[PDB]
């Protein structure tokens, strides 16, 4: 970031022989796209470049105190006079060559010295990849953190934007085959998930409510749905489900 | 017999997906693959040759259905 709110990530490390060298032999060490100025109107960066270049040239140290330079005494006039007094040009543009083709670019570039700060947010602290790992034991879903392995949340907005594509199987994959997917089995006649019970060791799940074991059939169902049926039973509510 | 003759994009997607999941489970490829390791490229190769013996069962909102052949369906 600069001292004017122009934050940005580092996208490339440009080789030092592919950088546009100036007619003085120099070569920039920061390349800043000129399109952040028109909409953000940080005209203080364009003045800091010239002030810092004039400082480095004359061994001085200029002040950037607010409200010290009026319309009559401008900052650009002052620092352009400083530059023109060092053999550079008023408007702060020195003309570069192309470090890749070796030709003097048609436009003269605006170069200078500005003070960069390095921010505390690094990709090394904000990057995550999960394949398989821990699980919330109440719902049997990924745990949900970065210090712990943790999964990223899909979300209801994403669930509603993914089924506007008509991709029902991408939704099935994300929400069902990746987060939680169990084989809870039900009594087909009673249609109840709480009723099938195992035995004491031919291990046959037998329905407790009606003593038959030919009526039990396994169903592929989420795990939070079984948790939901259990917490509903807790309230005496019954979820009767029709198996086909 | 009354629905559109063409193959909607959702139908193409699901048919390619199913044919690919079949090829990947060691199913015979009737398309003479030529060195490609992707089952989805093979499924597209088969769809272009009109060799897919699947029956799209289009469901109407009242339960009534119509069974179309993947061969008898204009792929755009």
């Amino acid at each position: 970031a600069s001292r004017h709110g122009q934050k940005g990530i580092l996208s490339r490390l440009w080789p030092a022989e592919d950088m546009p060298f100036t007619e003085s032999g120099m070569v920039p060490d920061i390349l800043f796209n000129p399109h952040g100025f028109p909409s953000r109107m940080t005209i203080g960066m364009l003045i800091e470049s010239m002030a810092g270049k004039s400082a480095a040239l004359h061994g001085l140290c200029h002040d950037a105190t607010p409200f010290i330079f009026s319309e009559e005494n401008s900052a650009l006039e002052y620092f352009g006079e400083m530059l023109k007094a060092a053999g550079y040009n008023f408007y702060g543009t020195e003309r570069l060559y192309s470090g890749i083709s070796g030709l003097e670019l048609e436009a003269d570039i605006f170069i200078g010295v500005v003070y960069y700060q390095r921010l505390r947010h690094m990709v090394s602290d904000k990057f995550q990849v999960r394949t398989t790992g821990a699980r919330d034991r109440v719902t049997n879903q990924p745990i949900g953190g970065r210090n712990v392995q943790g999964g990223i949340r899909f979300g209801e907005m994403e669930r509603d934007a993914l089924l506007a594509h008509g991709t029902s199987f991408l939704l099935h994959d994300r929400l069902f085959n990746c987060s939680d997917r169990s084989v809870a089995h039900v009594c087909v006649k009673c249609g109840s998930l709480l009723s099938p019970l195992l035995e004491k060791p031919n291990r046959k799940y037998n329905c407790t409510l009606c003593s038959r074991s030919d009526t039990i059939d396994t169903v592929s169902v989420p795990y939070v749905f079984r948790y939901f049926v259990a917490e509903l039973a807790a309230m005496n509510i019954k979820v009767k489900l029709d198996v086909v | 017999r009354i629905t559109t003759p063409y193959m909607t994009k959702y139908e193409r997607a699901r048919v390619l997906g199913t044919r690919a999941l079949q090829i990947a489970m060691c199913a015979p490829v009737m398309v003479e693959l030529e060195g490609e390791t992707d089952p989805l490229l093979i499924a597209m190769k088969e769809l272009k040759a009109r060799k897919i013996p699947i029956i799209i069962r289009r469901y109407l909102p009242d339960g009534s259905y119509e069974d179309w052949g993947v061969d008898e369906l204009i792929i755009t």
Partner: protein, 126 residues
Amino acid sequence: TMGFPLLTYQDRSDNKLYRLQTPQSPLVRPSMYDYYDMDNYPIGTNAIVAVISYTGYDMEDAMIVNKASWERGFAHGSVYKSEFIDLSEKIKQGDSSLVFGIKPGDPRVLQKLDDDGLPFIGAKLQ
């Protein structure tokens, strides 16, 4: 900002502490920066910036850094992670299960610890 946070390392035992190696003082700065000496604790570095559209990788808020400047020490830094190991944990009010120490010859700590169950000062950890 990653800067120079303080002068007394070896003493703080914080959790995280970001340090910039070679800070500089702005060549263009308000005079109040000099009333509260803020150069006792610098925050950034001066860089030669050109405002040019040249790469194709510096668009939409992204920036380009010369590679030789980055290999000559431009904006290098470090973090200090201090971890307080109080070993009254792993136990309750029983016998002292807690003394940093190595039983002699453990194949597990053959040469990574130094006989008081603590890494060497200067050793690299992975």
